Amino acid sequence: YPGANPKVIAETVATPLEEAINGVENMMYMKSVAGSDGVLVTTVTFRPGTDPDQAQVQVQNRVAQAEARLPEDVRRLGITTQKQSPTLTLVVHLFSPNGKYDSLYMRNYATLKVKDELARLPGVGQIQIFGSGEYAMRVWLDPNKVAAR
Amino acid sequence: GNIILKTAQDGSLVRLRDVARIEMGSGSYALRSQLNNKDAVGIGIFQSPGANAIDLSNAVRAKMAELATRFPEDMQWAAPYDPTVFVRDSIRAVVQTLL
Amino acid sequence: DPDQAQVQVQNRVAQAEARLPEDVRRLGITTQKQSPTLTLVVHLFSPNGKYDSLYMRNYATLKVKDELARLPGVGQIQIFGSGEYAMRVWLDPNKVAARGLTASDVVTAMQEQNVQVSAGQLGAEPLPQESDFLISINAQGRLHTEEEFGNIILKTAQDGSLVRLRDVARIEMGSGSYALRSQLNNKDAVGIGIFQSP
Amino acid sequence: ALVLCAVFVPMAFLSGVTGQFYKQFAVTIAISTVISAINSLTLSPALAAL
Amino acid sequence: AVIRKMSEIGMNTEGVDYAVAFPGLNALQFTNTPNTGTVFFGLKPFDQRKHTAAEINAEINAKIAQIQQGFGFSILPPPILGLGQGSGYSLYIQDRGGLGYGALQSAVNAMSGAIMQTPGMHFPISTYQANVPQLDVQVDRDKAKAQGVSLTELFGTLQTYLGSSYVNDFNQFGRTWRVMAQADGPYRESVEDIANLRTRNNQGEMVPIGSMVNISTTYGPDPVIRYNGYPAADLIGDADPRVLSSSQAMTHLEELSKQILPNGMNIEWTDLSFQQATQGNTALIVFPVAVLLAFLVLAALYESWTLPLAVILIVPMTMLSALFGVWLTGGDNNVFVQVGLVVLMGL
Amino acid sequence: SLTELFGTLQTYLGSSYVNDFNQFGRTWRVMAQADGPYRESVEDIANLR
Ligand SMILES: CCCCCCCCCCCCO[C@@H]1O[C@H](CO)[C@@H](O[C@H]2O[C@H](CO)[C@@H](O)[C@H](O)[C@H]2O)[C@H](O)[C@H]1O
Ligand SMILES: CCCCCCCCCCCCO[C@@H]1O[C@H](CO)[C@@H](O[C@H]2O[C@H](CO)[C@@H](O)[C@H](O)[C@H]2O)[C@H](O)[C@H]1O
Ligand SMILES: CCCCCCCCCCCCO[C@@H]1O[C@H](CO)[C@@H](O[C@H]2O[C@H](CO)[C@@H](O)[C@H](O)[C@H]2O)[C@H](O)[C@H]1O
Ligand SMILES: CCCCCCCCCCCCO[C@@H]1O[C@H](CO)[C@@H](O[C@H]2O[C@H](CO)[C@@H](O)[C@H](O)[C@H]2O)[C@H](O)[C@H]1O
């Protein structure tokens, strides 16, 4: 929910999602963390021995039922529901020794050329990428110049 | 930048670049990544239940090594953490203990 | 397998959603596997009439249902009687129309003035020099009380005065549903069915 | 071998995360015990006589 | 800037290969928070360095303790990703009575101090921090509407300029990317920058936001945390097994919380603690079953209901010898020791 | 327009879901409808404006 206060994310995004999810079979507990980056992460944890594919689909059914409750800008960006693969196998970094490339360039290099190649390898459960953000076309407005016209 | 916002008094077209700076930038500024104080991006590779961790780490390294032949010069990769060493050690220990 | 039937149905419903009327979609459709095996029926009731079914049903929703749903072996909890709280705006159509207003005007004003707000931050990137502080901003868009909903501004009259919702409507925290009632030995009640899982 | 299975195999049924750890040891040790007994009744005396 | 100083410290500590740094990353939640950062220090293989991980950690800590600009830490890692510790504990404090973010902060402070002064328990750590300075923009709705400014326009102006608006997508490099609109950073730095934003009334005139709002400083949490449907705060902490067991620790914290927390707050265990509090000890069945099964096998072998006892009654002595060696060397009774004991009893 | 005509029948006589609000820690609907005494007779229907 870009720009929204953590309190608004908790009240208008995390609260309806939790209301929908509440009651899913074999759930042990659930937590929501809403930050000033505008991002909500709600983590639903299930009893040991629960099939994680079954957990995934039941949570994605409840999310679908809440999606109509959500703020329009949240819905326009889209929500994701993803079972977690807890066993780390390897950390890999890309980096630039001389500084010719920055983290924005390298993260998007990983997204364009690396991640999908790794995700195809047998035995991979999840690939997580940490640092900078996907490219976006940024229009940086000067409000005085906008309002002058 | 050439998006048209309106017609001005004199008949000129007001463009987006007349009121904005436009750049291909980032979708998020909230998290940064460095490796030994160089700019970086980190990649966590998680196995599925039932995988062979040692084979998966080798396959990830081999794939990185193939991809890295096409990296632009001045971009490199590293594997700063490999927790498959722990079960590799246990296997080595079984063989040494048996001997 | 009831879980396979549930998922296959829920994914077909998801595909039907584009065909449904807009108002049905905005409320949301639910798909739920049924748990056939009842274990216990529990009621709340008011001996001396201090509380009605609307109060007791929402007490159960707020205070009971979730604590029951965590007990080992529960498959489904069903609540029977009254409905969820809803903020009810009961329009007098003669007064609305006398102010020159349509029902659609009223709905639009209520959607304008009870809304989620994104207020932004000061000191976020990009800056030519390094910011020292990131300050989040708060702005209240949503309303909470009957009084606040009654103070919604439907229009400005010709003398410039503000026409309020409470001037054309009676506003109350009421029921989302009047279809089903619940009594227990002729006292107001709400019923709770606890179903075990297999 | 049965006495050792009587001791070890119930240890595969303990609760919680530690129970999952105990199961890894208990089942592995019970297997090796049974196979070693098989070997002790077959290959080992056969080899000794030979 | 502080993370980069910590990275330099770790990089210049003998035995450290890498400073894997993430300014922004809150390690307790793995979400992003602007006043938090994480940096992992990757160690050389033991045989390429002189010092142990504990020695290296102790050295880094002495150096980062000299950084005045924030509170830096370096700790040993858990043996298992996704469970955390083993003797410690994890709980949330939940606010169930609508007491608000400030009372939750006071509850956190009060519990954390009381825990810090329990012997064998250090100050727990929390993601929660309700005293983050913020700003509150109080909209005079009557005055906006009286002059023809709709709240959609007013709110929308704040949202796009100060918060950014997702516009739509475009394609580049063969992929889909967002298009975003926002004020450039220099125009959203000050309270006056907010007040000078202009919206338009129904007459077409440009109206400054500042003429329809009151801006004041306030405080709020970042991030906001909820647990099982309630505003909440996490507490992660240690409990020294040589002082108190995890079970005594949990019992103490339950009692502390009953004395300290105001009516309408409570604690809930999570992660490994939730499992301990909700698991029964099936050893009370498993151990007698194991002894009875072994007795029965021996009663058959010996055709005697009494001779099995000559075997069964000696096994406590092996358990005693093993634990005595553990005790004499300062060890604990961890799962590797526990299986060692049972294998020795089998021998 | 039929949109206005049908919309008038729907909100006054059938109720319209407006949006949501928060109270007691939860989400609830906001609903608009004529009060009951204004939707009892066929004349009440005809008199909607
Ligand atoms: C180098 C670290 C290696 C991985 C260690 C992870 C173990 C931690 C366990 C907690 C679970 C992590 O949970 C993981 O959180 C991160 C947030 O940080 C999410 O990932 C997010 O992080 C950042 C935030 O800007 C973006 O770069 C990324 O694209 C986004 O997806 C993952 O989609 C989620 O799977
Ligand atoms: C041949 C292999 C046999 C292996 C069996 C050896 C041990 C057999 C069972 C251990 C005896 C008690 O069994 C188990 O003990 C452990 C540790 O003492 C307790 O464990 C408890 O304390 C530990 C740490 O103090 C916590 O991390 C744990 O979550 C908690 O449950 C369990 O509650 C109990 O169920
Ligand atoms: C030199 C490079 C080294 C890179 C190392 C990569 C691994 C780093 C692991 C650091 C974290 C280990 O500690 C781990 O923290 C995470 C995050 O709090 C905890 O995870 C917990 O919170 C996370 C975050 O919300 C939730 O997904 C979850 O409900 C819970 O399991 C783990 O239970 C704990 O075991
Ligand atoms: C705003 C909306 C409100 C949000 C709703 C909040 C969600 C409520 C949390 C759900 C709690 C589930 O409740 C919890 O269920 C778990 C998982 O089955 C059970 O957990 C336990 O069950 C048995 C007990 O021996 C064990 O086999 C199991 O391993 C153990 O985890 C507990 O008995 C119960 O404490």
Numbering used by the authors:
A (entry chain C): 51 to 199
B (entry chain C): 250 to 348
C (entry chain B): 101 to 298
D (entry chain C): 448 to 497
E (entry chain C): 597 to 943
F (entry chain B): 746 to 794
Q: What text appears in the publication on this structure?
A:
OqxB is an RND (Resistance-Nodulation-Division) efflux pump that has emerged as a factor contributing to the antibiotic resistance in Klebsiella pneumoniae. OqxB underwent horizontal gene transfer and is now seen in other Gram-negative bacterial pathogens including Escherichia coli, Enterobacter cloacae and Salmonella spp., further disseminating multi-drug resistance. In addition, when oqxB was over-expressed in E. coli C43(DE3)-ΔacrB, the MIC experiments confirmed its role in the extrusion of other common antibiotics with high efflux liability like linezolid and novobiocin. This suggests that OqxB can form a functional complex with the E. coli AcrA-TolC and further confirm its role in conferring antibiotic resistance against a wide spectrum of antibiotics. Based on the available experimental data and conservation in the transmembrane proton transport region, OqxB can be classified as an active transport member in RND class of efflux pumps.
OqxB from K. pneumoniae was purified and its crystal structure was solved at 1.85 Å resolution. The asymmetric unit contains six OqxB monomers/protomers and each monomer is composed of 1040 residues. Similar observations were noted with all the other protomers of the OqxB structure. This analysis demonstrated that all the protomers within the two OqxB trimer molecules are highly similar and are in binding/tight conformation. In contrast, the OqxB structure is symmetric, wherein all the three protomers are in a binding/tight protomer state with two DDM molecules bound to each protomer. The OqxB protomer substrate-binding pocket is located deep inside the periplasmic cleft, between the β-sheets of PN2 and PC1 sub-domains. Surprisingly, two DDM (n-dodecyl-β-D-maltoside) molecules are bound to each protomer of the OqxB trimer. The head group (maltoside) of the first molecule (DDM1) occupies the hydrophilic pocket close to the exit funnel, whereas the second molecule (DDM2) head group resides near the entrance formed by PC1 and PC2 sub-domains. Irrespective of their head group position, their extended alkyl tails orient into the hydrophobic pocket formed by several phenylalanine and leucine residues. The hydroxyl groups of the DDM1 terminal sugar ring form hydrogen bond interactions with two positively charged arginine residues, R48 and R157, while the second sugar ring interacts with the three glutamine residue sidechains, i.e., Q46, Q134, and Q178. The charged arginine residue, R157 present on the alpha helix of the PN2 sub-domain, is unique to OqxB and forms hydrogen bond interaction with the DDM1 molecule.
